[PDB]
Write an enzyme that holds these catalytic residues in place. Sequence first.
Site, PDB file in Angstrom:
ATOM      1  N   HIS A   1       0.544  -1.300  -0.273  1.00 42.72           N
ATOM      2  CA  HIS A   1      -0.129  -0.394   0.230  1.00 42.72           C
ATOM      3  C   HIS A   1       1.027   1.339  -0.401  1.00 42.72           C
ATOM      4  O   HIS A   1       0.535   2.475  -0.047  1.00 42.72           O
ATOM      5  CB  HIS A   1      -1.213   0.269   1.017  1.00 42.72           C
ATOM      6  CG  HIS A   1      -0.527   0.031   2.416  1.00 42.72           C
ATOM      7  ND1 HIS A   1      -0.397  -0.342   3.845  1.00 42.72           N
ATOM      8  CD2 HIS A   1       0.211   1.407   3.536  1.00 42.72           C
ATOM      9  CE1 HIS A   1       0.225  -0.589   4.600  1.00 42.72           C
ATOM     10  NE2 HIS A   1       0.353   1.062   4.599  1.00 42.72           N
TER      11      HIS A   1
ATOM     12  N   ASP B   1      -1.079  -7.659   0.606  1.00 36.25           N
ATOM     13  CA  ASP B   1      -0.239  -6.179   0.810  1.00 36.25           C
ATOM     14  C   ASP B   1       1.441  -6.192   1.578  1.00 36.25           C
ATOM     15  O   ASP B   1       1.583  -5.596   2.104  1.00 36.25           O
ATOM     16  CB  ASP B   1      -1.267  -5.624   2.226  1.00 36.25           C
ATOM     17  CG  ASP B   1      -0.152  -4.491   2.705  1.00 36.25           C
ATOM     18  OD1 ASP B   1      -0.497  -3.357   1.480  1.00 36.25           O
ATOM     19  OD2 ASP B   1      -0.154  -3.975   3.805  1.00 36.25           O
TER      20      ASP B   1
ATOM     21  N   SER C   1      -0.398   1.472   9.362  1.00 35.50           N
ATOM     22  CA  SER C   1       0.337   0.144   9.771  1.00 35.50           C
ATOM     23  C   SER C   1       1.765   0.328   9.133  1.00 35.50           C
ATOM     24  O   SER C   1       2.092   0.390   7.775  1.00 35.50           O
ATOM     25  CB  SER C   1      -0.196  -1.044   8.632  1.00 35.50           C
TER      26      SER C   1
ATOM     27  N   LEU D   1      -7.526  -2.331   5.874  1.00 39.30           N
ATOM     28  CA  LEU D   1      -8.340  -1.410   5.635  1.00 39.30           C
ATOM     29  C   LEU D   1      -7.902  -0.627   4.587  1.00 39.30           C
ATOM     30  O   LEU D   1      -7.670   0.783   4.240  1.00 39.30           O
ATOM     31  CB  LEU D   1      -8.460  -0.223   6.663  1.00 39.30           C
ATOM     32  CG  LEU D   1      -9.433  -0.611   8.237  1.00 39.30           C
ATOM     33  CD1 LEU D   1      -8.818   0.652   8.898  1.00 39.30           C
ATOM     34  CD2 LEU D   1     -10.313  -0.791   7.955  1.00 39.30           C
TER      35      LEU D   1
END
Lengths: 50, 396, 23, 346
Positions: B68, B98, B165, B184
Amino acid sequence: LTSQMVEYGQVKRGELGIMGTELNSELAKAMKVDAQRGAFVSQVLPNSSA
Amino acid sequence: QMPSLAPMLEKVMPSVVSINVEGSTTVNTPRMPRNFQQFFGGQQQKFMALGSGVIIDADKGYVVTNNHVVDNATVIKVQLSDGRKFDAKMVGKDPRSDIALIQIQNPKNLTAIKMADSDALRVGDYTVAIGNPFGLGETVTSGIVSALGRENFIQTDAAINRGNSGGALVNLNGELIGINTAILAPDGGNIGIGFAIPSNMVKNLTSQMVEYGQVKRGELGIMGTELNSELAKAMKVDAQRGAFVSQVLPNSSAAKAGIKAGDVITSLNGKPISSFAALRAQVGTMPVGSKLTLGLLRDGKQVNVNLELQQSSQNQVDSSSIFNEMSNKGKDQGVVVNNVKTGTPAAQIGLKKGDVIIGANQQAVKNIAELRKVLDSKPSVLALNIQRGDSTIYLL
Amino acid sequence: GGQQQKFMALGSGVIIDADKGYV
Amino acid sequence: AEVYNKDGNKLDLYGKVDGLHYFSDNKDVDGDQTYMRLGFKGETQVTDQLTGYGQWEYQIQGNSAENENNSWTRVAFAGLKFQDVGSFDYGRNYGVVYDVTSWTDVLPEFGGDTYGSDNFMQQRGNGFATYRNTDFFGLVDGLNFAVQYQGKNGNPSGEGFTSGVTNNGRDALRQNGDGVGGSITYDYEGFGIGGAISSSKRTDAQNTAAYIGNGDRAETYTGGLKYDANNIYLAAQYTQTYNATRVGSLGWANKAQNFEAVAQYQFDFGLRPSLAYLQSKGKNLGRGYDDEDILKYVDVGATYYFNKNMSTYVDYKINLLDDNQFTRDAGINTDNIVALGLVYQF
């Protein structure tokens, strides 16, 4: 079909219990389906065999 | 004197880096004026992202990080903990997990973390997270292993209230046990506790990006959701307890082999499929070319078929050290290029929608790792021995 | 808050060089 | 009619039946126009300072055969009011521009048509979040202001659109992006003065070659004046709009200048004659249309009130628009209309 209703109460037609539609539906797009050429499963019916 | 985590942190920090990404994306064109008491409902826009990463190969300058952060990057910069700055290039990424891999351009004197064995983790075990919460820098926070999934996402209370994160999850010995992630999506930021990919999975997904160009994860190419969706009702689905097929993906195996929106998968290789979820996760435990027969439901339909590499994890302007979205095709059967764009810098070079590349500008290109292995060694003359099925042309 | 369009203008001028026809 | 009032809750159930007929050379408006409206307004006392409310209004056409139903929701919203502070409500409601333009929307049948419904923040529309302050914390009698937000209402769902969709999507002439607006009005004795501003993002579906008046945002600027005393009602409003005023079915006007004026008198014996003038002048329209009248008419009428529950009226729309290519293309009515109505209400 008529005799079945008489001698059984209803017609003996089994269902796969899925419910859904084609690969054009808004949900087939809104969920982006890979390889489109078949039946889209929108939901599997409760207490069903599927 | 008093106990402290500072002594092992000093042996760990040199492996944690900061990452600054610069890149663009397509945003919609703002319609004016703006009326804030009117709830309504193409141009590239630059954005900046920042995150942490962990040096995983000191020699190759391989840094693991979250997808991300580097996603859509045009420019990715890395700054070591001692302050030295470097440039980096994409080598791999995988949106599901991710997790992404990058390579420092021109590494010199680097330190890599040692990876511990995720499988030996237990709940009361101590944990320490290292990340860049609000941009202001590299923050470390401590805690314990909260939940060991059992995909084995690791759950830990060493997170951060309202922060993004971070990255590394390390045990009391300074060994990497997981990379912290963001569940998320297309957001970053946590639900209240921390979720990490386990170190053993990180090692595994990471090597694939290196030795193949991408991770070998086959997709069934359907797209859809649960039996609660407005479309499962607006289309009234019989027997609801499975995955709703909203659409079958084009040029897919689901498409090729046979299937159409509506059918609700009920099983996969004999086993019950009660939710898209269950299914999306099950198809993720199967590498390309695999064969998985599943039962559908329309009246009582069922088929068997073989899947191909997913489309989520793909490459872009990093295959040819130059600049310009391919991916792997089946086994070592070359590198198949996918959906070309509008700027057409690569299409302009004689590359259509389905053009394979078995010719390494002369040699064998069974995969993007190899291909890219050549477009990096001999940057002089380049003739892409591409053959999109029939046409076997040789462009420059 | 592209195409060419014809327009017409009109004004006066003064002859400043009779030989060269400069206005 | 208040049909319930007990333990701090009140319910008013109201409505009307308008037996109505149009006479016009234009056969698309000519004939039976009978309709009914029904609604409720409810209020509940939460504390001495706090009141909750809701309102709903619905129109059902009475001029169709029984194999069809033409009906719609005019408003539907819920809200909270706090004594000497303000109110907030959300739902289908009136845009804040109407706080000012409503002052001239007082004609027996016609009027109020330099704008329409689902037309950015100009009149009725979906997804309005509306904040209002009355009397400035109760420290300036007669001074009111409002600020309003409208959420996007986009393309229909389930029709193959790949962008700009909302759950409640619709045709482009009735779409809107996010919008914000505000209004201020001051009323002293009989006099009134007011102003409003709105600014809405326009959607991609609205900005295609199929519609005139392409633009990033729709903006409106309105001023209004009112006099209401001694059995005399006078009001006028002027509005300048940008990519906001519809030009029939063609799309929108790049710029428009709208003006409405009304004069009314109330006789003791129940007769209320009315005189009005409305015009909408569009500029730089595109496609060679250049400057054109979008609307232009004089309205003469009268209502007779038998009492607060029964009335009858005649309204005569003297239509000053001439039949030309532009009005033909846009489908704008250029004929006169006489309306005759008989209305029972409760």
